[PDB]
Amino acid sequence: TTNFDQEALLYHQQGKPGKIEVISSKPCATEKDLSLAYSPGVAAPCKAIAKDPAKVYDYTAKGNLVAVISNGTAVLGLGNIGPAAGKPVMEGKGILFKQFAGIDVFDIEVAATDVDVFCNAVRVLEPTFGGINLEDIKAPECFEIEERLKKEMNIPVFHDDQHGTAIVSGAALLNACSITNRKMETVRIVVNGAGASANSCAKIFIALGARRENIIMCDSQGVIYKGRTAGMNKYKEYFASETEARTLTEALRGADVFVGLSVAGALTPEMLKDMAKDPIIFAMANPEPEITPDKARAARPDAIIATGRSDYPNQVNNVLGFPSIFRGALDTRSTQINEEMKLAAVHALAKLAREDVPDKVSATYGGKSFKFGRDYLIPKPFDTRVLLWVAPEVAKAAMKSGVATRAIEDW
Amino acid sequence: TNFDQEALLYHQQGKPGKIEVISSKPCATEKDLSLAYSPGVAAPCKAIAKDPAKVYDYTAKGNLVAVISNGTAVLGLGNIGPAAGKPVMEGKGILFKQFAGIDVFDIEVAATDVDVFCNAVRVLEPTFGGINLEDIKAPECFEIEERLKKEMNIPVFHDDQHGTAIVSGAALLNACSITNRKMETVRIVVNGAGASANSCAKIFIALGARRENIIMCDSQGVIYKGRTAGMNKYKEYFASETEARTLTEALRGADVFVGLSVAGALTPEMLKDMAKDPIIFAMANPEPEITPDKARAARPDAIIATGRSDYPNQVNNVLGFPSIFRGALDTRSTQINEEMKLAAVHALAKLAREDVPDKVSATYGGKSFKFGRDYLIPKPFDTRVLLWVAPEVAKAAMKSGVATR
Numbered sequence A: 001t002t003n004f005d006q007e008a009l010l011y012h013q014q015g016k017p018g019k020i021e022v023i024s025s026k027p028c029a030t031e032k033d034l035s036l037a038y039s040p041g042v043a044a045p046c047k048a049i050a051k052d053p054a055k056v057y058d059y060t061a062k063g064n065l066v067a068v069i070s071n072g073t074a075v076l077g078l079g080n081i082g083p084a085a086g087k088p089v090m091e092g093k094g095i096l097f098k099q100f101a102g103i104d105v106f107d108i109e110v111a112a113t114d115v116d117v118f119c120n121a122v123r124v125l126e127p128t129f130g131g132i133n134l135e136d137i138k139a140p141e142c143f144e145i146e147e148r149l150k151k152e153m154n155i156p157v158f159h160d161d162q163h164g165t166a167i168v169s170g171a172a173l174l175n176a177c178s179i180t181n182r183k184m185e186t187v188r189i190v191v192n193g194a195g196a197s198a199n200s201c202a203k204i205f206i207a208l209g210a211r212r213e214n215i216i217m218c219d220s221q222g223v224i225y226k227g228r229t230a231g232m233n234k235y236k237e238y239f240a241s242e243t244e245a246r247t248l249t250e251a252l253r254g255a256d257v258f259v260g261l262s263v264a265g266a267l268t269p270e271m272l273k274d275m276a277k278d279p280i281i282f283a284m285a286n287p288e289p290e291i292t293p294d295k296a297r298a299a300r301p302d303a304i305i306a307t308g309r310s311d312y313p314n315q316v317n318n319v320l321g322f323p324s325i326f327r328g329a330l331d332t333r334s335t336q337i338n339e340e341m342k343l344a345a346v347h348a349l350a351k352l353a354r355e356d357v358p359d360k361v362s363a364t365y366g367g368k369s370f371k372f373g374r375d376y377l378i379p380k381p382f383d384t385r386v387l388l389w390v391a392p393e394v395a396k397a398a399m400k401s402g403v404a405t406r407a408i409e410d411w
Numbered sequence B: 001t002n003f004d005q006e007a008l009l010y011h012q013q014g015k016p017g018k019i020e021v022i023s024s025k026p027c028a029t030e031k032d033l034s035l036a037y038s039p040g041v042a043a044p045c046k047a048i049a050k051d052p053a054k055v056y057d058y059t060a061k062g063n064l065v066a067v068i069s070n071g072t073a074v075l076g077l078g079n080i081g082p083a084a085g086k087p088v089m090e091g092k093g094i095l096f097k098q099f100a101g102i103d104v105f106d107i108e109v110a111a112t113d114v115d116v117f118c119n120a121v122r123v124l125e126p127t128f129g130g131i132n133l134e135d136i137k138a139p140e141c142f143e144i145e146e147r148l149k150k151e152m153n154i155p156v157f158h159d160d161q162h163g164t165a166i167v168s169g170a171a172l173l174n175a176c177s178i179t180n181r182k183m184e185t186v187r188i189v190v191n192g193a194g195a196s197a198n199s200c201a202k203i204f205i206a207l208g209a210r211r212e213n214i215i216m217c218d219s220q221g222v223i224y225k226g227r228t229a230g231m232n233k234y235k236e237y238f239a240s241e242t243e244a245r246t247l248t249e250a251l252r253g254a255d256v257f258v259g260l261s262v263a264g265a266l267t268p269e270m271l272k273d274m275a276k277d278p279i280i281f282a283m284a285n286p287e288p289e290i291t292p293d294k295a296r297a298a299r300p301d302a303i304i305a306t307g308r309s310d311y312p313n314q315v316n317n318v319l320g321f322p323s324i325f326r327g328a329l330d331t332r333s334t335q336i337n338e339e340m341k342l343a344a345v346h347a348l349a350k351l352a353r354e355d356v357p358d359k360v361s362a363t364y365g366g367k368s369f370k371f372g373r374d375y376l377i378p379k380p381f382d383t384r385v386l387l388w389v390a391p392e393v394a395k396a397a398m399k400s401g402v403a404t405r
């Protein structure tokens, strides 16, 4: 819909260009005000921070400030459009941080595609920020970039395209498994796609109890089988499967779970018929899914379906993750977002969906009723319980794992 | 002091720090967010991919300045490091917002090597409409600003260097006018050879001063040609043929003293042998090279400006950078060049000759102001400044061809 596009263009240019403004949180009108905000008063917190570096969190915005950082090499589904073109998306990501977790964001678009240039530039920004959310950086560069920055920086570094997606889909999968009386240890999973998100999703499924041998990964050229060499790399190699299947169709034979992280249309009804009873179908290709819940329900009335879209039930929406994840990490002044923290967020999201849904949430969604089951197995994005459930569990995981530098006693 | 305690509480209370980032557009509903983020946010991205200039139409780039420091010369605190400088950079951003309506991301960078710092900062270009370098020590700051100006296609401006040059240059033009002087024959003595001093001398030459009429002194006295002690590439440029060796000897018959050094550096005896109607810029902080009363006591015909708000003629940098960047941003300029800097000088000098509104008088407690020896430049809280200076900078950018809008 190109007129919907025009609504978006107008939105971005109307009044003042763009979507963000930086304002003072303190009085700044009078000469007295400015004698505190600036010279000579501002020397006091500077001296305090020089003597005790931790006090940077007491006297600046650092403790609530995340950088959303991209080089614009994988923007949304638009591909490598460059950092300037990606800036609206990074401003938008920042707005989600603010609206869902109260976190201030500097969106930082970096003109560097070289891994060393990019990492060298970002590493030295640490004094500015309480955390770094890497965004829309293409695979496989994003794997090296994230791992290097996590090692080199002493503040949390988290690439949402990789792990946010894994966290929310993992939560959904745990619940889908519960609803269908499945054990993770025996569930057979097919992942369609082998990019930034598929890699992390596969890894978290294993972390949640799935076996590598029960997971088959497919790409643009079919099943990633052990021995294969076409279009292969270090990361695809890890998930190369001993299977005899070569097509997506073959891989789905008797499979329990389809995880779609590829492109629209990739999954048809015929492929659906041979899946196991109560098939679990996550069709997350944007903006159009691998399949529709209706086409899926038509082929398989017993199917459980999640997608990336808010107009269908069970949206695997990344906004369920990163805001609370950084809230918990920031509030404990943590030096990392580690695996313990990611898993804590999985389990918090999963558990929340199992609770009775307050009238407030139904009223937010037009009076729709929600109860845990096949049409509701992950929290709604506009449910205010999400921050309350996920952020403290992340904070507790940071303290338990020893990456917190500030204890939080209670909420 | 109670004031330090007040300052600490100001920073620590409420939301820690001094800045918040907010949405400038509606962002409460599913519909709102379908435009602010996916799927609608793809539209401006596609527009920008096709026509790069549209980044200025659809993002905050055109109103967004990075205040960037590695914390190596923070205020008068020296090399305290990037984190400890963060309160100062947040506060600088506050000034940008309050005086020019400019949004700032303060960026504290953990790199002291010129090369590493530059390589980290120049790739941030897509984010910003302009870069204000701040509180970076000399001589590294010269090399850094020079290199970034060569690499980046947005304005790069180190305020410590050029802000004081611009405002003191406006003050100097007016001082010369008042005392019937011509810049081409004025003899100037610059005390100090650091970040700000060097730029001051360069602005004076641009305003018509002759390089031969300028003597620069540092911690070891006059910088004379042939001297090697404590020299560098930048001091070398301003090395003088003069036989003077001390600040005292240099000031004999001098018209102007520009003090960018340390307190007490200027005594009354040096003042004695200055020319009639000596112009004295004592801008050392927090205590000037000499006080206004001690100066007029020695020389009653003296015209004096300082860096302090408690005396007349405050050479305050807030008179410069807000309008300079406002003008640069509004013309979507690729540079702040010498033409733009000079445009700011002349506009500031011109505003000072205008009648001072009661609003300004009221702002400063009924104190009247009329262009003269006690009023050489606009007051910092004069709201006319942005309206006067920024349009002149924009005109300069367009005339010199660095404007893209």
Ligand SMILES: NC(=O)c1ccc[n+]([C@@H]2O[C@H](COP(=O)([O-])OP(=O)(O)OC[C@H]3O[C@@H](n4cnc5c(N)ncnc54)[C@H](OP(=O)(O)O)[C@@H]3O)[C@@H](O)[C@H]2O)c1
Binding pocket: A076, A077, A138, A139, A161, A165, A192, A193, A194, A195, A196, A197, A198, A218, A219, A220, A221, A222, A231, A260, A261, A262, A263, A266, A284, A285, A286, A287, A307, A308, A309, A316, A317, A318
């Ligand atoms: N919460 C969500 O809804 C969510 C989150 C993240 C991602 N996604 C969606 O998942 C998709 C990929 O995201 P990404 O960040 O991972 O991108 P990516 O890094 O580019 O990954 C693309 C992957 O898809 C593979 N592929 C392309 N065509 C295929 C086909 N017909 N069949 C099977 N695989 C195919 C590609 O194979 P090759 O490697 O061989 O080229 C590649 O592995 C996008 O649509 C994204 O919108 C959704």
Ligand SMILES: NC(=O)c1ccc[n+]([C@@H]2O[C@H](COP(=O)([O-])OP(=O)(O)OC[C@H]3O[C@@H](n4cnc5c(N)ncnc54)[C@H](OP(=O)(O)O)[C@@H]3O)[C@@H](O)[C@H]2O)c1
Binding pocket: B076, B137, B138, B160, B164, B191, B192, B193, B194, B195, B196, B197, B217, B218, B219, B220, B230, B259, B260, B261, B262, B265, B283, B284, B285, B286, B306, B307, B308, B315, B316, B317
């Ligand atoms: N608008 C304003 O009010 C304003 C603006 C900018 C600066 N200032 C003030 O000017 C002074 C310099 O600032 P800056 O940033 O330029 O500092 P800077 O970079 O450190 O430069 C210091 C300069 O002062 C020289 N110096 C040290 N002691 C001296 C002495 N007794 N006599 C003469 N020169 C001496 C140094 O000489 P060596 O090279 O030999 O070390 C050096 O050249 C500071 O007090 C600053 O607060 C005021």
Ligand SMILES: [Mg+2]
Binding pocket: A076, A135, A136, A160, A161
């Ligand atoms: Mg992303």
Ligand SMILES: [Mg+2]
Binding pocket: B075, B134, B135, B159, B160
């Ligand atoms: Mg400064």
